[PDB]
Amino acid sequence: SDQEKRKQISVRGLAGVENVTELKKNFNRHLHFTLVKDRNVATPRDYYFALAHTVRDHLVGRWIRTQQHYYEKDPKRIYYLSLEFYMGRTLQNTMVNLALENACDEATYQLGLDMEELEEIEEDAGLGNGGLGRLAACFLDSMATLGLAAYGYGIRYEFGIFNQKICGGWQMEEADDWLRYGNPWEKARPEFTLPVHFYGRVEHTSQGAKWVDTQVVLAMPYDTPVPGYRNNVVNTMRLWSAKAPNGYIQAVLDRNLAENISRVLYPNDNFFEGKELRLKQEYFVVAATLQDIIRRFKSNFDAFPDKVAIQLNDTHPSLAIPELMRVLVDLERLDWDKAWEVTVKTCAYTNHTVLPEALERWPVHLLETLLPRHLQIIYEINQRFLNRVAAAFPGDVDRLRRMSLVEEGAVKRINMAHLCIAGSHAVNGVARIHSEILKKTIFKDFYELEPHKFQNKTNGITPRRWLVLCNPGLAEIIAERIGEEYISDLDQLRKLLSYVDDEAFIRDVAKVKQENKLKFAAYLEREYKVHINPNSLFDVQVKRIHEYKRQLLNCLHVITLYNRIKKEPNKFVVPRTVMIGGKAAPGYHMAKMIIKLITAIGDVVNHDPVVGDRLRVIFLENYRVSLAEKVIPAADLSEQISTAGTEASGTGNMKFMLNGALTIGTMDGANVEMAEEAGEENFFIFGMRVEDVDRLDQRGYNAQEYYDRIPELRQIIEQLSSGFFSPKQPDLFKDIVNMLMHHDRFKVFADYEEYVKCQERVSALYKNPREWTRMVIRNIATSGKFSSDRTIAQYAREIWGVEPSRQRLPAPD
Amino acid sequence: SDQEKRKQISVRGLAGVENVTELKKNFNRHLHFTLVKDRNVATPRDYYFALAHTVRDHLVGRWIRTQQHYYEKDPKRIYYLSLEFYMGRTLQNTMVNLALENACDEATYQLGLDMEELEEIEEDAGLGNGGLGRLAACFLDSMATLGLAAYGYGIRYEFGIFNQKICGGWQMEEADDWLRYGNPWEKARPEFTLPVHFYGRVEHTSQGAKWVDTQVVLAMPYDTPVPGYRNNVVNTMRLWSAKAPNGYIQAVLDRNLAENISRVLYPNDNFFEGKELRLKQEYFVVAATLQDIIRRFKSNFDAFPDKVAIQLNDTHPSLAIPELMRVLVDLERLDWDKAWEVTVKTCAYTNHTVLPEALERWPVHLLETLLPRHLQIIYEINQRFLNRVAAAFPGDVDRLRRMSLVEEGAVKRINMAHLCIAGSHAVNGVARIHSEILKKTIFKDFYELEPHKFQNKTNGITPRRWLVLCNPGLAEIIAERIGEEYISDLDQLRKLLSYVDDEAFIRDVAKVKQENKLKFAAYLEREYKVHINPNSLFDVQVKRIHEYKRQLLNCLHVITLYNRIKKEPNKFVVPRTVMIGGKAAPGYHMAKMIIKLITAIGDVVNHDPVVGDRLRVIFLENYRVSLAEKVIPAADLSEQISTAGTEASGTGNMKFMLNGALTIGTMDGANVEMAEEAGEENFFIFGMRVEDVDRLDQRGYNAQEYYDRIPELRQIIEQLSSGFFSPKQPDLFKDIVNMLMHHDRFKVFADYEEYVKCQERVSALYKNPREWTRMVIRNIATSGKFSSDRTIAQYAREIWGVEPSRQRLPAPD
Ligand SMILES: CN1CC[C@H](c2c(O)cc(O)c3c(=O)cc(-c4ccccc4Cl)oc23)[C@H](O)C1
Ligand SMILES: CN1CC[C@H](c2c(O)cc(O)c3c(=O)cc(-c4ccccc4Cl)oc23)[C@H](O)C1
Ligand SMILES: *Cc1c(COP(=O)(O)O)cnc(C)c1O
Ligand SMILES: *Cc1c(COP(=O)(O)O)cnc(C)c1O
Ligand SMILES: OC[C@H]1O[C@H](O)[C@H](O)[C@@H](O)[C@@H]1O
Ligand SMILES: OC[C@H]1O[C@H](O)[C@H](O)[C@@H](O)[C@@H]1O
Ligand SMILES: *[PH-](=O)([O-])[O-]
Ligand SMILES: *[PH-](=O)([O-])[O-]
Known part of the structure; x- marks a missing residue:
């Protein structure tokens, strides 16, 4: 008995075979037992939520079967790190990809409701600025449709891209309180919160480097399901939320300072603003993401690149390179050369612009006080990288100054793109003409050193x-x-x-x-x-x-x-x-x-x-x-x-x-x-x-x-x-x-x-x-x-080393 | 057809007749579709939540039938305003009051789980300091058991009374992150958010006083069900949460300043600390509570006291007296005398201590800049009240100085207890000896002026x-x-x-x-x-x-x-x-x-x-x-x-x-x-x-x-x-x-x-x-x-004018 009794706990049967009678039954249940409403006070919004929750059940049923399937199969996993995911509305998308549209239309109709009116209650999840953020969202939809074990990792901003109001002909900004009424698609995961460290210093004991005296900020994940098109595959988009760790009143109020990291999405598109809060956001998502990855990999590191692929959506999550090195060297105690090998073979970088004012160059003074150990690891990577350049082009000191990850001047800065190229086994442009420009202009030097690294993956x-x-x-x-x-x-x-x-x-x-x-x-x-x-x-x-x-x-x-x-x-x-x-x-x-x-x-x-x-x-x-x-x-x-x-x-x-x-x-x-x-x-x-x-x-x-x-x-x-x-x-x-x-x-x-x-x-x-x-x-x-199916298929085959698939999983029941 | 079709939307049938087979069915559903878990990763905590949600369904079913019943019957409603509600754990209480205990024990047992282990996962909802806060919680349980249409109104603190750690023999304080894993019993109600105003000034137009140029803070209610003992009555405890209304980045971050109002519960027991944040908290709960009350009353004011009873749990929500007057005079435009009549007949005050350092005396300079209009209304109430004292004791100027709502000195202050006595039709002690002490000591003067107002209601x-x-x-x-x-x-x-x-x-x-x-x-x-x-x-x-x-x-x-x-x-x-x-x-x-x-x-x-x-x-x-x-x-x-x-x-x-x-x-x-x-x-x-x-x-x-x-x-x-x-x-x-x-x-x-x-x-x-x-x-x-059943019965009969009842409502189905 005992443990054998828990076998009754199964997704076995769910909210329905995907048809009218059961849909109506669940709609009714959710309206009363989930929203705590009745047909007398229910507003169209309450009715939209009841339908959203009803539809979510079918999504979750598959969400659970998919993850169970991945644990069993143990395929190489793909992690798409992005500081932006412009998802938009979810109700209709889900109904379409799951083929629930017609049945839901009939069910609502029978209950004396109009689904299109309901669908229009839903607003966007604008956790993006535009092109870059929406590409990630299209990519998520495609990877799910192509049967890839992919995860989208980012930040769960309290306020997404501001809402634009036009007053007197001028743009006025208004915070986008997208969570005002809640979000029925996400699922908070406090039980999986991880710590992220900031500031502190580095001391060098007899057995390695130690990052001590740091300030801690917790990263609590919120999971969102992403349904592929009619294949019953539902992947995950995990977004981190900042939390303070655990006189007196003021001390409790000051906990807001730590949770400010995931408060708002910087509203800049194709422009770099060297703000410390932004840098904190980039390391926040990176630190927590890599922990989650290595943990998931554990439940030695020679096979890491065989089971893990980390794709850097621009230079934003570039800190992933020195962080992965930090973890492997400082914590897992791998020798430098082996760690690096694993690092380059795991990461790949995607460039999205050639304009200089969009490229990230963080002042070192900002990096030394905020992430000392990472600045140290970056300098070491630089020295070793330049040593290779020096070896491939003897006497070309000018090329050394041009390819260095460090830019000299009144204000020393770290060129994050150079870091990405050095620590990535593949760099790619997002359009043929763009990918060529990268090879003969801003990245000509790097292309000359490692031609094999440069690719193209035309957007979609x-x-x-x-x-x-x-x-x-x-x-x-x-x-x-x-x-x-x-x-x-x-x-x-x-x-x-x-x-x-x-x-x-x-x-x-x-x-x-x-x-x-x-x-x-x-x-x-x-x-x-x-x-x-x-x-x-x-x-x-x-x-x-x-x-x-x-x-x-x-x-x-x-x-x-x-x-x-x-x-x-x-x-x-x-x-x-x-x-x-x-x-x-x-x-x-x-x-x-x-x-x-x-x-x-x-x-x-x-x-x-x-x-x-x-x-x-x-x-x-x-x-x-x-x-x-x-x-x-x-x-x-x-x-x-x-x-x-x-x-x-x-x-x-x-x-x-x-x-x-x-x-x-x-x-x-x-x-x-x-x-x-x-x-x-x-x-x-x-x-x-x-x-x-x-x-x-x-x-x-x-x-x-x-x-x-x-x-x-x-x-x-x-x-x-x-x-x-x-x-x-x-x-x-x-x-x-x-x-x-x-x-x-x-x-x-x-x-x-x-x-x-x-x-x-x-x-x-x-x-x-x-x-x-x-x-x-x-x-x-x-x-x-x-x-985007075409684009993801190429990334999969040319960069991630995983074969796309349209094989469909069986429905939950 | 059409609207007639929505009649299918009914609580009609719920999660079950209250027995094992159905309980197990819902436990399984919630474990997968609500928590997005499966029997392989589920922890005891996940299992506790699955049981809590399963039990909540039965609670909600009755919660809905009760409120529907109140709207139909339209009984006088009782509002218990308190800045504290020390509720404690809810799972077992709910199971007991609903007679679900045995069935839930069997259901879990059959699923290979131990309910007592599960019940112990739940921690307290410590939104109180001690005696005063726990009395309110006992009162809520009793009013529900006595079939009274009562509502508990307070603040939803992010952090309740601090957790006490003993280090080196000394008390150490640690924030009480009671919401870390969520709260399955509450139901957020963003659709019912109301605005609360602060600061500003008062201008006197040709048709009355206007409180303008204020700063706004929204009050979003979170409803919690309180089950009576086996009568199928579930009342509500509505707690308000502070929200900011709707360069650029800093402006979004500063929204934290407004939401700080409901951040933490002042950890003082029987002691007054004149902090502006505390005063904001007191008016926050009062302003939003009274709006909600007058609104609920509307969906002229001569019958207000017949349908409404506001009980002030200490002087904390005392601002309810000048606020109700402000609303009736400034907004509803009632003449002063009629407004006051309605106000006194609606409110009643409960005193909980005789110690001077626990009594609230807010400096006027704090009141004039934070709530100008209320300071004005308070002075007017004072003048009119003292005029009555002067009339009842000619020549006794000393008694005038002693009973004034205003205390003179280097620092002018408003004695909130005097305000409560003046604007309440009943004042009561919480124990016979206490109620007598009030009549011959600190409130002797008031007792002499209006003996009829003073009562006793021994705690329970x-x-x-x-x-x-x-x-x-x-x-x-x-x-x-x-x-x-x-x-x-x-x-x-x-x-x-x-x-x-x-x-x-x-x-x-x-x-x-x-x-x-x-x-x-x-x-x-x-x-x-x-x-x-x-x-x-x-x-x-x-x-x-x-x-x-x-x-x-x-x-x-x-x-x-x-x-x-x-x-x-x-x-x-x-x-x-x-x-x-x-x-x-x-x-x-x-x-x-x-x-x-x-x-x-x-x-x-x-x-x-x-x-x-x-x-x-x-x-x-x-x-x-x-x-x-x-x-x-x-x-x-x-x-x-x-x-x-x-x-x-x-x-x-x-x-x-x-x-x-x-x-x-x-x-x-x-x-x-x-x-x-x-x-x-x-x-x-x-x-x-x-x-x-x-x-x-x-x-x-x-x-x-x-x-x-x-x-x-x-x-x-x-x-x-x-x-x-x-x-x-x-x-x-x-x-x-x-x-x-x-x-x-x-x-x-x-x-x-x-x-x-x-x-x-x-x-x-x-x-x-x-x-x-x-x-x-x-x-x-x-x-x-x-x-506490005895105590509430007396309040009901001697103060609220409502008859207690053990009549049971029919089960949801
Ligand atoms: C000289 N000066 C001009 C304005 C510029 C600037 C700002 O001061 C503030 C901004 O928000 C932006 C922005 O969003 C995009 C671009 C941009 C991006 C790509 C190509 C050309 C330009 Cl101008 O520039 C911005 C920067 O201070 C340099
Ligand atoms: C003279 N001084 C003594 C300490 C007192 C004080 C503080 O400075 C700080 C506090 O947190 C408290 C408290 O919680 C309760 C009481 C109290 C309450 C009732 C009866 C007697 C006392 Cl001492 O007093 C407090 C105040 O500054 C006056
Ligand atoms: C697709 C999309 C973009 C990208 O537009 P481009 O013209 O490629 O820059 C930007 N914003 C939104 C809202 C989008 O849907
Ligand atoms: C009931 C209760 C109190 C009240 O205790 P007294 O001895 O009356 O002051 C205080 N704290 C808690 C936790 C309680 O349950
Ligand atoms: O790659 C996604 C997008 O990134 C940036 O927004 C570029 O401006 C745009 O050209 C590109 O399409
Ligand atoms: O009335 C509830 C409680 O209020 C205060 O805590 C008093 O100290 C206490 O005596 C009383 O029991
Ligand atoms: P079940 O054990 O999930 O099918
Ligand atoms: P139903 O219309 O709620 O019983």
Whole structure:
């Protein structure tokens, strides 16, 4: 008896075979016994939670079977360390991946409820800034769908990326209290809390180095399940929360200082801010993550790289290299050389930008007092690494200074990217053009030393959330000709090329875009009382505000469209609704000025009676994942106009392509590969290429030359300077004008002419609905290469050494 | 259809008819779907949580039916405002009150688990300091058992009363992270959050006063169910949590300043510390509580007192009087006189102490800047109140100065007790002697003005937790002769007097005490590796450390016992294990010195070979509700030796009586009434009475007179002064000695002789087990008057105007 009796404790049978009667039963139970409510006081929100909990049961049932399966099989495990995971909404995603959607729709319907109304109660889990954070989220969805034993590790921020409010045309920041009503998907794990150390000092006893006199901060994990598509695999995303360890009153209040580490996500995108709190956050997630990994590995180290793969999402968790060394040498007492071997073979680094001001260079004075032992370990790694460089290039002292992990100057700094390259067995770019730039520019030296380390892994988006979820209409007209296999094998959309001349398909593609455009216009009016003509070309640019992303270039074109209608008021032009959305880092002046200019322009354009509904400029407030799932499926033209060579890859570009929009962009990042897949004849490429940018830099960029040679451009600048877009404050945009004229690192003027002319070609094709639609079909049909399933499959095979699999596990019962 | 379909959403059927098969089914479900665990990684803690959640379902089912019942019936509602609620453990209490104990025991047993091991995983919810907080908790249990529509309102402190650690014989404080693993009984209610205002100013517009420019702090309620005994009534305890309202990073971090209000419970017992954070806490709970009340009342004000009763647990929530006035006058715009009428008729005040240093007197300068409008309203109430006094006693200006709510001096202060008396329709003491003292001393003036307002409501404890729960053995031997009716009608224990000469009952009473003593000794050894002789008289004094509670007097007796054994080493003495436990307010020097003396004494006594097991002094570390439920049932002698007139009532005294221990105490608080109920011949009363204390104060207390006249006392003092109990630091107790000799406000020396002689009488009776046991039976049988059911019944009938009821509601299904 005894222990044998506990065998009754089994997931054996769960909340149901996945059908209406049982779903309704559990919905009722959760509404009363979980939310402590009844049908008389229950609000739609209470009803959304009851459905979320009901659906979560089915998820957990598989979550448990999956982890049990991993413990038994013991596959090599993959850990994706990221300081960001932009997850978005979970209810619908879960229902879709688990095939619960239809049954849940019926169950709620029978209970006198509307599921879509319920689904809309859920807001985003915005623990990310944008591209980097959302890539991680797409990766999590893909690894689960590919049957990989992967874990996402990050920080559980109390407040994610701020909510953007537009006041008087300016961005205002409001904390994103995403946990106000709780989070039904996560599961706190206090029983697994681990300690993280800070400050202290290092003493060298007779048997090694000891990091003593430190301050401790606990890391409590919160687990979130990530369901693969219909394979019954549910992986985990473990996020750490900071806790203080365990006069009198003030001492208890001061416990807040330690828990401040996981309070808020730094709202910077592609920019480095050397703040100690940020450094604490990076080591916080790293220290706790590696403990959890080595522990999970234990329940000697020669086989560590065979069972463990740690992927560094940018340099943010780079401290993982000296930490893993610290643990192996100082605690496990492995000899240095063996520890290092294990370390390099375990880690791999992914770079996401080439812009200098985004790269992390921590002052050593900050590292010596906060993580003394790590600074020591880093110097040693540096000395040994440089010794190898010296050996491979005798006499090349200059190369030694260039590759050193240490930068000299008034302020000594540690170049975290160099650290990542040294301690990683693989370094990879996120787009072919980006990966090549890394090999001939910023990382040329390292590439020359270890060519074998450098790879490329072109980004991708998950077709689940970014097609099946956000664009059900498109997903169904597609499914009715080629089936549903494409959903987890996107390269099958290639079959659609067989319908480029099919009248029924052309009709359906255009009708779905129009329904989406119609639906989006009804959403804008509803929540923001904003009107937009649905029978106009939806010109959309949504991404974070950046000088490099050149929202300003888009602004110049808008005013050019406006001026042209004022010059020839009665001439016909294809109606346009230009939409620009995105947030600016709070401290990014130019970015905030750019947002004001956009609204300022809309203020003039939108109220000019002569213009009417021929042109409308709208700034989409609070752009986020949930909004992207809304506006992107209703887009016609996708703006991807970053200066050639500045956008590592981009993913928004991919979202638009899969959703029926045509692209106008530069030969930058993945734009290059999307054009290659669809054919340049089906794309709208324009402007300078990387070479043209470089040549201009050699001779020198003089924006005045373009000003003096382009009349329409002169007029626009004169309007901005004049106070034409700010009558009550004539010099309001003086900062934007001077930047463009004398300090524009992104050459907006240099691409203006080719940009406007290319925009003319867009309107031309739009005037011909049938041809426009047909070109779109050629795009949608060639977007398969950009499925995150493809990207993860490569990481798995070329970096992690694990074979992807679509094998499905049996349902819980 | 439609709305009619939602009728399917019902509590109709719940987790089970209250039997094994279904209990096991839900235990399994919760273990996997709620805790996300499986039988392979599940720890006893995970198993305790699975059982707690399983049991909670049955509680919630009734919780929902009860509130639905109240909305339909619309009875007058009773709100018990307290800054403290010392609840303790909930699992067993719930199982008992719901009659789930046996079935749950069997279900767990069948699943290969031990419920008692599981129950011991649960720790206290120590949101209280001691007596006052635990009285509220007993009151909550009783109101539910008496079928009253009552709500407990307080603050949800992140950290309750600190955990006490003894290091080097001294008390060390450690934050009580009671929420580390979560709380399965509460239910957060973010959807019911309310705003609380602070600071600001008052401007007087043409239509009234306006409190503007304030700072806002949100109050989010967390509901906890309180089950009555087998009547299917589950009331609510709603506790408020502080939340901040909704550069950039620092602004988000600073949100901690607002949430600090509900961070920690001030650890002071019977002492006032005029800290702004404390004042914020008092208004925090008051402001949010009254909003919730008026709101619940709305879903004109002449009938407010007919549907609402607000009971002020001490002066802590006294701001409820000016707040209710503020709301009625400033917001509801009622004329002053009508508002006041409604206010007095709604509120009632309970006083818990006569000691001056416990009474709240807030400096006006603190009130004007923090709650300006309330200071204004208070002055107006004062002027109008004094005008009435002036009218009732013309020319008595001195009485005006004495009764004023405002105290003049260098530092102007508001006497909160006077405020409570003025704005309450009833004021009550917590014990007959206490209530009389209030009428002839500190509140004589007010009593003279409004004799009708003053009442008495003798405290009481709940027989559920304090007998059926903590002492199952006693509860069963009692149940086998008179049944179980006494459980909710304690006056039935009177029937036991019929067994004072029954050999079987005498045998059983003594055997149960011995089993408890045996069990307690096994608990002490287990967790604290402390040994105690179970065949010795268990002399126990557990309560907070206070000079007034005179733990020191007990210390003098212990050393007297020690010295006597050293004087006549071979003379026989009844073996004793003296136990003293309790916490000292962190800043209470004397109290901390008293704790050290106790351990210091144990250090000498416990290691003296000549003494051996004839005497053992033990300091019970971290005394709390859960420990009280352990040590009290194993006690033989209950120490209640406060100076006559200082202990308002006491409740520990009541706990011991109901559990089979004899009492040695002064004629103080409820000790007076317990002796009256059992008969002084069955009690051990000693020392000065209130009159004797007062006479000594008239002529003057000279401790040297007792020192010079009592040889044994001189010896003890000489030992303390000598360094006999602190050889490494001879003058360590100089503070205790000097206090006793020259500044002892509690006259420990004055009661020493009568105390020791009375202790001689105790040992005498113990030498005769049969007679001791028989006296105990006379105590247990006369403890019925001290059931909190009796106390709540009186409040209900004499103050709240609601009739108590034992009518049971139908089970959820
Ligand atoms: C000279 N000065 C200009 C502004 C810049 C700066 C700030 O002062 C504050 C910020 O929040 C940002 C930001 O988010 C992104 C970028 C950035 C990033 C990549 C390429 C070019 C730029 Cl300008 O720059 C920022 C920094 O102080 C250097
Ligand atoms: C003169 N001085 C003595 C100590 C006293 C004091 C403190 O400085 C600090 C404290 O934490 C307490 C406490 O908890 C209880 C009592 C108290 C309560 C009732 C009766 C008698 C006393 Cl001494 O007094 C405290 C205050 O400063 C006045
Ligand atoms: C996909 C996504 C991004 C990335 O957009 P890019 O144009 O590649 O920079 C940014 N923000 C959100 C909300 C996204 O969904
Ligand atoms: C009942 C109780 C008290 C009250 O004890 P008194 O001796 O009346 O002061 C204090 N603390 C705890 C833990 C209690 O259970
Ligand atoms: O790789 C994910 C993303 O990282 C950064 O946001 C880059 O700016 C972007 O080009 C890339 O797509
Ligand atoms: O009324 C509850 C308790 O309040 C205070 O703690 C008093 O010290 C005590 O005598 C009383 O029993
Ligand atoms: P069960 O033991 O989980 O199937
Ligand atoms: P049901 O409508 O709760 O019984």
